[PDB]
Amino acid sequence: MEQVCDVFDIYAICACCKVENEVFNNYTFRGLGNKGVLPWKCISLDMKYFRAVTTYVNESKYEKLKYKRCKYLNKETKLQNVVVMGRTNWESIPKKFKPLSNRINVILSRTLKKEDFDEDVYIINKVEDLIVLLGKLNYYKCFILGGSVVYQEFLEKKLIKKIYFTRINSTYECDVFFPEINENEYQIISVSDVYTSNNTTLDFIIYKKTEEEDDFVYFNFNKNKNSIHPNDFQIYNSLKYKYHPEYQYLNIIYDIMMNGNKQSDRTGVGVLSKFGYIMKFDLSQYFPLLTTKKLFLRGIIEELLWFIRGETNGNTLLNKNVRIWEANGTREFLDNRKLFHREVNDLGPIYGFQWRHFGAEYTNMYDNYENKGVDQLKNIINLIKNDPTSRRILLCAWNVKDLDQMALPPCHILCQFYVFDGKLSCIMYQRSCDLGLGVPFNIASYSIFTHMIAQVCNLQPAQFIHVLGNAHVYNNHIDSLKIQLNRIPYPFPTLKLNPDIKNIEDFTISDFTIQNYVHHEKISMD
Amino acid sequence: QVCDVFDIYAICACCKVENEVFNNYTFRGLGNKGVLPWKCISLDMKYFRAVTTYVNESKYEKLKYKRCKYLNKETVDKLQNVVVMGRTNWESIPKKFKPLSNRINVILSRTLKKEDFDEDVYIINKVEDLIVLLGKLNYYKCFILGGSVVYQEFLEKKLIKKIYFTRINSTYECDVFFPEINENEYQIISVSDVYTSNNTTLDFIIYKKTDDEEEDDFVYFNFNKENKNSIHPNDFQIYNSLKYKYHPEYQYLNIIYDIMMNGNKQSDRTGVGVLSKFGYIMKFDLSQYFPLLTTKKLFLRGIIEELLWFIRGETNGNTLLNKNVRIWEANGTREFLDNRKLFHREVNDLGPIYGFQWRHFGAEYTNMYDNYENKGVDQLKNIINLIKNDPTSRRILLCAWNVKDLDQMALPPCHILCQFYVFDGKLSCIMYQRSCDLGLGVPFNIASYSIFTHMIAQVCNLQPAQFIHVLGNAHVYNNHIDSLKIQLNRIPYPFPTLKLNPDIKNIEDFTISDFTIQNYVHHEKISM
Numbered sequence A: 001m002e003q004v005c006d007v008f009d010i011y012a013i014c015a016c017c018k019v020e021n022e023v024f025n026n027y028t029f030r031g032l033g034n035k036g037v038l039p040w041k042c043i044s045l046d047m048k049y050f051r052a053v054t055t056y057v058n059e060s061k062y063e064k065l066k067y068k069r070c071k072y073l074n075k076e077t078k079l080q081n082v083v084v085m086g087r088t089n090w091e092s093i094p095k096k097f098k099p100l101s102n103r104i105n106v107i108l109s110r111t112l113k114k115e116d117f118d119e120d121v122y123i124i125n126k127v128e129d130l131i132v133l134l135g136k137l138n139y140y141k142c143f144i145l146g147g148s149v150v151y152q153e154f155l156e157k158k159l160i161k162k163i164y165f166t167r168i169n170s171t172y173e174c175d176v177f178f179p180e181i182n183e184n185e186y187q188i189i190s191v192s193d194v195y196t197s198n199n200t201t202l203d204f205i206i207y208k209k210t211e212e213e214d215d216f217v218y219f220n221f222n223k224n225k226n227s228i229h230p231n232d233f234q235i236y237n238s239l240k241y242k243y244h245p246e247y248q249y250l251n252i253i254y255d256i257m258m259n260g261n262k263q264s265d266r267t268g269v270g271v272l273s274k275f276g277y278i279m280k281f282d283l284s285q286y287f288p289l290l291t292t293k294k295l296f297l298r299g300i301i302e303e304l305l306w307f308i309r310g311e312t313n314g315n316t317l318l319n320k321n322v323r324i325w326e327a328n329g330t331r332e333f334l335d336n337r338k339l340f341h342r343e344v345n346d347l348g349p350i351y352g353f354q355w356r357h358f359g360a361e362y363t364n365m366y367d368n369y370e371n372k373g374v375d376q377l378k379n380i381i382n383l384i385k386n387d388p389t390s391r392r393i394l395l396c397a398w399n400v401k402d403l404d405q406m407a408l409p410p411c412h413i414l415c416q417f418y419v420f421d422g423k424l425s426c427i428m429y430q431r432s433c434d435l436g437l438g439v440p441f442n443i444a445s446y447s448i449f450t451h452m453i454a455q456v457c458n459l460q461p462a463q464f465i466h467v468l469g470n471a472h473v474y475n476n477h478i479d480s481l482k483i484q485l486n487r488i489p490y491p492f493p494t495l496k497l498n499p500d501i502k503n504i505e506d507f508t509i510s511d512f513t514i515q516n517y518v519h520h521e522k523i524s525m526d
Numbered sequence B: 001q002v003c004d005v006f007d008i009y010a011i012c013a014c015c016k017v018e019n020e021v022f023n024n025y026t027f028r029g030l031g032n033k034g035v036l037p038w039k040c041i042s043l044d045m046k047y048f049r050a051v052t053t054y055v056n057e058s059k060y061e062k063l064k065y066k067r068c069k070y071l072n073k074e075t076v077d078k079l080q081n082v083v084v085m086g087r088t089n090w091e092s093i094p095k096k097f098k099p100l101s102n103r104i105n106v107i108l109s110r111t112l113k114k115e116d117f118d119e120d121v122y123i124i125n126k127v128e129d130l131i132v133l134l135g136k137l138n139y140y141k142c143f144i145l146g147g148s149v150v151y152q153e154f155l156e157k158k159l160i161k162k163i164y165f166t167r168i169n170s171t172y173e174c175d176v177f178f179p180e181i182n183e184n185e186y187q188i189i190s191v192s193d194v195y196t197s198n199n200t201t202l203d204f205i206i207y208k209k210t211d212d213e214e215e216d217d218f219v220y221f222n223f224n225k226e227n228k229n230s231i232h233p234n235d236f237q238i239y240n241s242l243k244y245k246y247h248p249e250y251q252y253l254n255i256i257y258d259i260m261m262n263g264n265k266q267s268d269r270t271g272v273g274v275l276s277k278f279g280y281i282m283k284f285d286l287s288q289y290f291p292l293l294t295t296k297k298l299f300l301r302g303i304i305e306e307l308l309w310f311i312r313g314e315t316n317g318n319t320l321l322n323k324n325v326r327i328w329e330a331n332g333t334r335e336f337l338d339n340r341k342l343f344h345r346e347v348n349d350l351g352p353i354y355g356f357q358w359r360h361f362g363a364e365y366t367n368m369y370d371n372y373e374n375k376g377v378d379q380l381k382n383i384i385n386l387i388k389n390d391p392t393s394r395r396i397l398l399c400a401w402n403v404k405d406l407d408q409m410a411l412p413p414c415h416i417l418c419q420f421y422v423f424d425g426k427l428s429c430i431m432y433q434r435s436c437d438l439g440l441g442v443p444f445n446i447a448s449y450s451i452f453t454h455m456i457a458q459v460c461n462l463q464p465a466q467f468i469h470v471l472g473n474a475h476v477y478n479n480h481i482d483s484l485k486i487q488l489n490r491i492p493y494p495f496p497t498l499k500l501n502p503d504i505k506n507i508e509d510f511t512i513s514d515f516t517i518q519n520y521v522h523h524e525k526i527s528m
């Protein structure tokens, strides 16, 4: 008829870390505590979150809660929340925080009774006594704070209506663990933005138990296009709040699937296409390596270093077993570009040559172009250092003169940089965007490049901003992207650079570390 | 009050009538010679039927409750709306539409007999008889449909809760007019998107008499979202008093507001100081309007000449100056060039700027008088050919940022590139701007590249779709702040329209006389 946890609004809130090429799932985050305390030193942002949720009340909503609880109990006609702790949980809290401020404190125990406590707290020695207590109290909501024993038995008994679950994206030694959530009993309905706090990333997810209004209608008086189906996005559409920054990428895919224009293309596969998007990623808070599928970064980092050296020799990448440019360097591909006098894997005056030698005459991939052309990479590093408010800090790969000599014209047209308050942001304009295959890597590439330029200019990375021009999904990718859109992102990883690298030319592959990459399974887009 | 008890609204449509000053009264034409002043404008008709038939039955129980208590009753003893038409208005409606479908028809008439119409059609003979009739009916809301007499008397009797006012942005001969809405009595609260229907733009404004399981979760996710810039948002009383701000000019205005509220204080070369942010997109639908800002006056002749000068490939600033187009004057002075270290550059020789790069990218620049025929890459020709011959190309770009020539330019281009996109016979254009003077430069820039998109689309036999503006370093000069505060609190008018001479089929064949702005309605000019 009614559930106890719905009448009395019984929630659980917790924070779980990871515990010691692996496979990941929701149970990856399950570390609760260690040796009777928390596994980590204070993660302060989670404490602020935990305090806002457990202390927040809305007075205007109590009368309905009050009415509803009377009806269930068969009774007639400042506000605070109730919080429930195991006895072990209670003893691990620092004394200066007890009783938890502005909350009604309740402790479960058998070995201790109210005579053993100095504080303003309720003792109860069984779960049934909490329901009795709640029927007699005036309160807004009831939050179960753990520990592990308390969680397990409240989940066991179907007494939890929502789990407020912080995912701590780092590994610690643990000896107690959140119960394995039964995906048939609970589903994720919301996921927050990603944050960094105390040298770890984290997000907040929510499991749920499984007049001027008419003017709006008037103004919408004038509102199965692409053969895409509802049930094919059930998980994606069931989420209420989608604040994880990975949704900037997934929503654009959704948008192209549901509203894109059908078109042919140079390749003949055919695409759905739209025109003009912007994504923004906060590199101060996370490294935006996509988590709804597995991505590798060694190739794109070697590519970036190969760019910065000004190289155009495709053999250099192939010798590191990086095959990104291999198809663009074959005799057949070059011939079909009319590059009949071009040696195999000589890609012509592409990215690297334009960044270090714009306007120089290209000869072959072995020439020494020292002091030919405009070394715009050096120029923009100098403007950032010495003229940070300049609105001319731009790095351009679209050299109109050289386009036909390139193996193919650049997609990443330009980077513009912005400096404020000791922090560096970067816009990259992409003329053509393969959303299913290329954009994931391109986000990672320029995100890394922003870190490198910021460090050698002694700035901190801020936003990477990604403007998409012709944004398209290949029809060959649609079934894979349907799978991918129905996965829930994980908290992003972090990127660390060797801090002793002071000049842009001095990085090597080993100066980069990606830490705490948690990700869904690899996907063949075909 | 009566009109709040019984939910009495007015709904009307007004055209313009036969340096002009504009105001809300500019739109006041109701009828002419017993008919509507215009041929049918189908979009306003669709909105009309929608407003006057829409009913939310779940919301009626409280309206019935409210009306009964007002009348000291307990009962009123399918929910439709009520519609009130004057007799002139009622008789001039085509026969096959009367009685108005799914509406309770009510007619003010001192000469019509209750007999000649069915029992479902009501006939009153004074205004207070409607209040009596509303006391005895079940209805959602009561709409006053006109005509001029009915508007005037209902309005001077303070019997109107809101006005749903369609602004028809064209001119017609009229002999009856809406009453001048006293802005001390009513005020605009919501403004719609701009539209094109039957060869006129129009918009829709609203005048006003003067699971919470997921509500809490919203609060928690805001737990860290703890105004910073010495701006007092009470200076934007009108702006923040609006409820629905759907006019596409709000794309521009919302960005000024964002930079004021949240911009970063930075200095610049002139010491003036700016508020800046990084990264915006605006999109304007050229199929439905020409986005010439209306919250201040904008002139376009110089803007068009500069474009034509670009297309000719010119770099000689004297050409513009002899036409009194002075956009580039300050960049061509002896002093400005010397500061650029261009010691060997003639005054007003701007070097290899836009026009030279569009028609001659990669050519060696000598001076502004040289013959550059067939030197360098003719990008403009190239992209026009790609549009016509390979329209699904993702390489249709027009780039002015020639890294090799920047230092020889009087200054590097602010408009880095245009990219084009073709689908189903329609042309859209993205322009990326590295540096955006929101107060002065950006309004002109939206117009320049909106026009350019029309020109490219016509010489390619395409229709213009969107113009899409990407702002890089976006700034408000500190000395514009007072002027933009005034501008944020003006309500835009429906946009004008751009017409090109349809005979021009080559990008190089346009002349100044081939461009006409139609029905530009605007607020007064502002010195920034």
Ligand SMILES: NC(=O)C1=CN([C@@H]2O[C@H](COP(=O)(O)OP(=O)(O)OC[C@H]3O[C@@H](n4cnc5c(N)ncnc54)[C@H](OP(=O)(O)O)[C@@H]3O)[C@@H](O)[C@H]2O)C=CC1
Binding pocket: A013, A014, A015, A016, A031, A032, A033, A034, A035, A036, A037, A038, A085, A086, A087, A088, A089, A090, A092, A108, A109, A110, A111, A112, A124, A125, A126, A127, A145, A146, A147, A148, A149, A150, A151, A153, A176
């Ligand atoms: N990261 C997080 O989100 C959280 C972490 N933690 C960590 O978890 C650990 C503590 O959790 P845990 O070790 O599982 O111990 P708990 O905090 O779960 O409390 C255990 C004790 O609570 C009492 N108790 C539990 N259920 C009942 C009941 N039905 N009736 C009566 N008394 C009851 C008993 O106390 P008695 O023995 O006196 O009967 C039991 O021994 C610590 O490491 C703590 O720091 C704690 C909370 C949340």
Ligand SMILES: NC(=O)C1=CN([C@@H]2O[C@H](COP(=O)(O)OP(=O)(O)OC[C@H]3O[C@@H](n4cnc5c(N)ncnc54)[C@H](OP(=O)(O)O)[C@@H]3O)[C@@H](O)[C@H]2O)C=CC1
Binding pocket: B011, B012, B013, B014, B030, B031, B032, B033, B034, B035, B036, B085, B086, B087, B088, B089, B090, B092, B108, B109, B110, B111, B112, B124, B125, B126, B127, B145, B146, B147, B148, B149, B150, B151, B153, B176
């Ligand atoms: N686009 C728009 O927004 C609208 C346009 N129109 C146009 O408006 C024009 C009509 O202007 P108008 O002539 O002012 O139309 P009206 O309907 O305002 O004519 C008023 C009539 O209503 C009756 N009436 C007025 N006041 C009273 C009263 N206090 N008590 C009783 N009966 C009353 C009289 O009928 P009697 O003669 O029997 O006394 C009078 O002739 C037409 O050209 C029509 O096309 C129509 C509706 C709205």
Ligand SMILES: CCc1nc(N)nc(N)c1Cc1cccc(-c2cccc(C(=O)O)c2)c1
Binding pocket: A013, A014, A015, A038, A046, A047, A050, A051, A085, A089, A093, A094, A097, A100, A101, A144, A145, A146, A166
């Ligand atoms: C890691 C923390 C945490 N985060 C989240 N999201 N859920 C949790 N169940 C906990 C653990 C917890 C439980 C009970 C009280 C405290 C506590 C500590 C110190 C001070 C206070 C206070 O309220 O001042 C509370 C922590």
Ligand SMILES: CCc1nc(N)nc(N)c1Cc1cccc(-c2cccc(C(=O)O)c2)c1
Binding pocket: B011, B012, B013, B036, B044, B045, B048, B049, B085, B089, B093, B094, B097, B100, B101, B144, B145, B146, B164, B166
């Ligand atoms: C110019 C139109 C208009 N727009 C708006 N916004 N307000 C208006 N007062 C009118 C004029 C009007 C008034 C009464 C009935 C009709 C009518 C005509 C033909 C058919 C129907 C119908 O309902 O089928 C109604 C028009």
Ligand SMILES: O=c1ccn([C@H]2C[C@H](O)[C@@H](COP(=O)(O)O)O2)c(=O)[nH]1
Binding pocket: A266, A408, A409, A411, A412, A432, A433, A434, A435, A437, A438, A439, A442, B394, B395
């Ligand atoms: O870094 C890259 C390089 C290529 N592409 C994709 C976009 C297009 O699908 C294709 C290039 O095609 P053109 O736009 O040049 O035709 O490769 C990317 O998304 N990112």
Ligand SMILES: O=c1ccn([C@H]2C[C@H](O)[C@@H](COP(=O)(O)O)O2)c(=O)[nH]1
Binding pocket: A391, A392, B411, B412, B414, B415, B435, B436, B437, B438, B440, B441, B442, B445
């Ligand atoms: O067409 C133009 C030309 C200039 N500006 C403004 C932007 C900057 O305020 C200034 C450009 O100077 P720098 O970005 O080079 O500093 O001119 C525009 O907004 N639009």
